[PDB]
Amino acid sequence: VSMRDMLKAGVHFGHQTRYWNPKMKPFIFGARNKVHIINLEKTVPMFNEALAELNKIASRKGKILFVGTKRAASEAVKDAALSCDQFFVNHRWLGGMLTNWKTVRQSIKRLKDLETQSQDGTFEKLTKKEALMRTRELEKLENSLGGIKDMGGLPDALFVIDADHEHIAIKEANNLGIPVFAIVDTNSDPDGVDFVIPGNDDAIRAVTLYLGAVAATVREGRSQ
RNA sequence: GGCUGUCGUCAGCUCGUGUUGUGAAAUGUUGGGUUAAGUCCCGCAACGAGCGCAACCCUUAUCCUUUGUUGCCAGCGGUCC
Ligand SMILES: [Mg+2]
Ligand SMILES: [Mg+2]
Ligand SMILES: [Mg+2]
């Protein structure tokens, strides 16, 4: 990544001054038009070091998970995870995914069974009434947990967009002792994150830049 | 002990794991619609399950296949009708 490359993507833009958490005063360069500006000169090295640690942990062959739930970036996180060979969650995070995994395993199994029934030639003996509810259940289950259908255990690293919106996941990770790699805007609390990446978290361009950089770095980490 | 009345055939009553609180406890079971119904859908720190509601049981209302006695008489013949 480069300062020139990411300055054109509008990363430095933050939120309104009325909303800034004081927990990240150092990360703010200044203000303009009553809107904060994020400092590039420090967000570059921390991002690079996070990427280094990330592909280092990837080379150990460790599964990782991408949390991004805004309706404007579900497609981007899905694309990164798919062309990453790694996993994702792109809808409402069901509380207790990590800390209550021994229960969500059952829903994973049910989704697998129902997918086999659907794409195995079974949804024709049903009397056009319960087949529809089976399809409805399929759609709900895949939209809620389709990106984690093959954990086979807890992950190792958990990557989050907009740490503030995803406090449940960060708390899950802190409870279970799993490192967190998150992007925080000028209104979040970075205490639960041990690898803080300052910057915007809602603009599509910045989100795409983050996801592309992470997907690349982890591909070269896996190829190692 | 067993059996029965009653609230009341009212729509409610709970549990496992997770989270919150020093604790008694809370959540789920709250919210928007909807229903005869905690009935269903959408949201959601909750994710699921059990007993209840509904369906499976008996009867009544239409049609068809089979058998025609002690039951029936449309078309035939006779008749004390
Ligand atoms: Mg406690
Ligand atoms: Mg509450
Ligand atoms: Mg209650």
Ligand SMILES: [Mg+2]
């Ligand atoms: Mg309660």
Ligand SMILES: [Mg+2]
């Ligand atoms: Mg409701």
Ligand SMILES: [Mg+2]
């Ligand atoms: Mg029910």
